[PDB]
């Protein structure tokens, strides 16, 4: 698609244990992004 919008996160203070795989931002949108505006919730299991 096209963009819809167009000392805390220090790189010495954050364990990169697993590379954050990008679909986490889909699966859990509030917990993995800052500013989740115009976001839709997901049906996740049947």
């Amino acid at each position: 698609f096209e963009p819809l919008v167009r000392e805390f996160n220090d790189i010495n203070k954050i364990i990169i244990r697993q590379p954050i795989r990008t679909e986490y931002k889909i699966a859990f949108p509030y917990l993995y992004n800052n500013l989740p505006h115009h976001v839709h919730l997901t049906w996740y299991h049947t």
């Binding site: 996160n9 954050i14 954050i20 509030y30 917990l31 800052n34």
Partner: protein, 195 residues
């Protein structure tokens, strides 16, 4: 878990505070432990040289700590009954069965506090007065955390010499609480800290 914090962050944003929030990557809480008997023990006093505390550290077994976490080895009953439970479950010594002082960072904590200084603990009138300040320093220093202020799991602290001056009456308690704290730090940090 993941979905719990996702739900509460959604709730936080959409119900009470509409403010955009920077949120870092999640870390877990860690703990601390000791896996072997202590080295040549450190004894330390206050700025005024009055009262000393000698403590070693060695790990109480896995079963001991997990049963203290399950409340069955609670000291709230008779000391004789507590000692008999130690004897019938872990081959515990009788002289060590009736001398245990406290637990640790809460009512049921993963540490344990033992006294065995049989010739020198006949000084009981001068021991038990500051024993409660040792407990007030013990619980507080075990919920503080030396390394990165986490909790201390599965470590036995054992006092082997109590040298306290005659009739302190204001010095003893208030000065021995940071002494209990600092000797707890020394006995933990000296001879196998682990995460």
């Amino acid at each position: 878990g993941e979905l719990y914090l996702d739900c509460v962050m959604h709730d936080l944003r959409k119900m009470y505070s509409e403010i955009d929030i920077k949120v870092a990557d999640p870390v877990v809480t860690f703990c601390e432990t000791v896996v072997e008997t202590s080295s040549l023990k450190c004894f330390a006093e206050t700025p005024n040289k009055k009262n000393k505390i000698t403590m070693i550290a060695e790990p109480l077994e896995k079963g001991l700590a997990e049963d203290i976490e399950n409340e069955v080895v609670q000291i709230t009953w008779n000391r004789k009954k507590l000692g008999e439970f130690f004897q019938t479950k872990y081959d515990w010594d009788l002289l060590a069965a009736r001398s245990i002082w406290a637990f640790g960072p809460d009512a049921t904590g993963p540490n344990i506090l033992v006294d065995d200084t049989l010739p020198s603990e006949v000084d009981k009138a001068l021991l038990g007065s500051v024993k409660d300040s040792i407990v007030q320093g013990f619980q507080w220093g075990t919920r503080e955390g030396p390394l990165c202020d986490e909790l201390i799991r599965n470590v036995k602290f054992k006092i082997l010499d109590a040298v306290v001056a005659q009739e302190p009456l204001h010095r003893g308690g208030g000065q021995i609480i940071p002494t209990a704290r600092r000797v707890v730090y020394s006995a933990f940090l000296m001879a196998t800290p682990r995460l």
